Amino acid sequence: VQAVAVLKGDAGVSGVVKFEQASESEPTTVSYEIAGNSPNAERGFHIQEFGDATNGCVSAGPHFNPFKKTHGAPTDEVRHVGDMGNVKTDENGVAKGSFKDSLIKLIGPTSVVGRSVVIHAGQDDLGKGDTEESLKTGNAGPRPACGVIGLTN
Amino acid sequence: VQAVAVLKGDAGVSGVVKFEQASESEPTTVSYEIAGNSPNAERGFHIQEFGDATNGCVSAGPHFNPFKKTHGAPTDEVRHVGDMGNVKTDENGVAKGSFKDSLIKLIGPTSVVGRSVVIHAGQDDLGKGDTEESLKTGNAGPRPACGVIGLTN
Ligand SMILES: [Cu+2]
Ligand SMILES: [Cu+2]
Ligand SMILES: [Zn+2]
Ligand SMILES: [Zn+2]
Predict the structure, then answer these.
(1) Residue (of A119, A129, A148, A126) closest to A32 by Cα position
(2) What would you report as the CA-atom Rg of chain B, rounded to the nearest whole angstrom?
(3) CB contact under 8 A, A148 and B152
(4) How far is CA A16 from the centre of its chain?
(5) Do A53 and B6 touch (CB under 8 A)?
(6) Burial (CB count <10 Å: 0-12, 13-18, 19+), residue A91
(7) Is the Cβ of A61 closer than 8 Å to some Cβ of chain B?
(8) Any idea which fold B1-153 has?
(9) Distances (CA, A) of B17 to A2, A35, A97, A109, B31
(10) Residues that bind substrate, according to the entry (chains A, B)?
(11) For chain A, does the N or the C end have fewer beta carbons within 10 angstroms?
């Protein structure tokens, strides 16, 4: 199964995020290419609960969290399903890479198809900040771009 | 279950399409408000197979047709699942209305969540044209706007 989300916004940030999962038990491979970010920085990269784009990136809701856990790093055992951590941007402000994740799925009851992907304006503190907000959003700041994860071939 | 698709494009046409289905066996209620169309006209309104927006509205593919039937009117027994027919536009070029459909579903194997909705530039001939194209696209023309159907609450 394949899916793709085209990140758009009014802040100069844009990109494409591709997802791939052969079967439900398998990890999903997330590939991304995002431009227009601050150069040489880490930026919060998360999957939101809804794919509602009626009010910009705001209507996408909070991080996809079906198991009701606190915000964390992708490698943390306690993290939201949509917690993809930070993506690094180069001297030209482009973030490009890929990784596999075993909580994010394109198949089954927790499928992220129809939900949104958000690239943040700030860095994700990975749930390590001494704040309640750290456990909710990782304090990653505004959402300059987002896109609904749609089906593809 | 609720879903929404925000129709956008570079041709002045835009809008919102809302979907609602309580349970799989139930019809889905499609509500729409679309502006920027030709005034006092009928325009093809369809659901495409993919929600891939990487190449404008083109990457969405053909009409969602899991049962491999020919193009038809929504009331036809032989139609594509994504065949929503034409929507009427008023003297100001706005198409606004709602209807229920029993082939379009937000739940189950034929769910349209993650797929795209397209508003056409031309009228749908409802599969009655004396052309092979009539049985494929209804000859509805270009796709000025489209949006990926995402989950909402
Ligand atoms: Cu976030
Ligand atoms: Cu069409
Ligand atoms: Zn989170
Ligand atoms: Zn059709």
Answers:
(1) A119
(2) 14
(3) no
(4) 12
(5) yes
(6) exposed
(7) yes
(8) Immunoglobulin-like (2.60.40)
(9) 24, 30, 34, 24, 6
(10) 143
(11) C
